[PDB]
Design an enzyme around this catalytic site. Structure first.
Site, PDB file in Angstrom:
ATOM      1  N   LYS A  42       0.789  -1.255   0.000  1.00 51.38           N
ATOM      2  CA  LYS A  42       0.000   0.000   0.000  1.00 51.38           C
ATOM      3  C   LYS A  42       0.827   1.315   0.000  1.00 51.38           C
ATOM      4  O   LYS A  42       0.331   2.381   0.375  1.00 51.38           O
ATOM      5  CB  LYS A  42      -1.078  -0.031   1.138  1.00 51.38           C
ATOM      6  N   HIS A  92       7.299  -6.668  -2.760  1.00 48.18           N
ATOM      7  CA  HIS A  92       7.241  -6.071  -1.438  1.00 48.18           C
ATOM      8  C   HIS A  92       8.391  -6.553  -0.521  1.00 48.18           C
ATOM      9  O   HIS A  92       8.344  -6.301   0.680  1.00 48.18           O
ATOM     10  CB  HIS A  92       5.878  -6.377  -0.772  1.00 48.18           C
ATOM     11  N   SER A 122      -3.776   2.447   5.559  1.00 47.44           N
ATOM     12  CA  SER A 122      -4.030   1.681   4.338  1.00 47.44           C
ATOM     13  C   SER A 122      -3.790   0.195   4.524  1.00 47.44           C
ATOM     14  O   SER A 122      -4.559  -0.632   4.000  1.00 47.44           O
ATOM     15  CB  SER A 122      -3.151   2.161   3.198  1.00 47.44           C
TER      16      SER A 122
END
Length: 244
Positions: A42, A92, A122
């Protein structure tokens, strides 16, 4: 929807199907013209990818002409494997867990960092939606879980710092989500130039058209002071620096 299993792998929480393929992820084969977009979850991955697609074509309609997450498997490896070059890859992973081929081939990496308070909010909602991610608990529980880094892909603090420390000796363009929100034109040009495009005083404007603080409504003042005290202890090399 029932939630899937999440386990530690190399020191960070990951979807258990990720864990099950760790040696395959690790041995990922990069190519020299691979472009990697690396962010904490996010922190602007999709947005950055759109800008990069647009940069590469400049023309908005021929862009529907190519996304795989190195680590993911419902897999990112397979979609990557069968993609033409130059590939745009996503991850990520914290820097110390990056498949070594990405560094051996000296691929361009774009890291985007986001202020941790908005990122926490988020990520909290993301976990609420995404079955592959652990149950976030209540907001008050989640605040502590995130502060401790007990989330997929590990501590936010370790994540951003590891990537920032890497930018000196590896080919990383380190961007801030807030800068992209404030001064997109300036950021798109940095990104264009990093990627090898000498673009136009006016091609920028097309992409700028075609493509912060909200956390304050979610943090109590008590949460906030606790967050800041924690942050100050974890974040001691204050060239690294966020707009809140």
């Amino acid at each position: 929807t029932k939630r899937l299993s999440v386990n530690y792998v190399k020191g960070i929480l990951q979807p258990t199907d990720t864990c099950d393929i760790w040696d395959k992820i690790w041995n990922f084969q990069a190519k020299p013209d691979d472009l990697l977009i690396s962010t904490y979850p996010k922190a602007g991955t999709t947005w950055t990818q759109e800008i990069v697609e647009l940069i590469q074509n400049e023309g908005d309609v021929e862009k529907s002409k190519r996304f795989p997450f190195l680590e993911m498997k419902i897999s990112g490896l397979e979609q990557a494997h069968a993609m033409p070059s130059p590939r745009i890859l996503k991850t990520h992973l914290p820097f110390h867990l990056l498949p070594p081929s990405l560094l051996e081939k000296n691929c361009k990496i774009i890291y985007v960092a986001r202020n941790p308070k908005d990122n926490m909010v988020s990520y909290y909602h993301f976990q609420r939606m995404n079955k592959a991610l652990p149950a976030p608990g209540t907001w008050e529980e989640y605040f502590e879980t995130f502060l401790a880094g007990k989330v997929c892909w590990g501590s936010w603090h370790e994540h951003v710092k590891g990537w920032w420390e890497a930018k000196d000796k590896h080919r990383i363009l380190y961007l801030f989500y807030e800068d992209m929100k404030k001064n997109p034109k300036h950021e798109i040009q940095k990104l264009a130039e990093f990627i090898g495009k000498k673009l136009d005083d006016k091609v920028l404007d097309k992409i700028v058209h075609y493509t912060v603080g909200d956390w304050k409504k979610h943090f109590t003042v008590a949460q906030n002071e606790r967050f800041d005290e924690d942050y100050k202890k974890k974040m001691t090399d204050t060239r690294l620096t966020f707009h809140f």
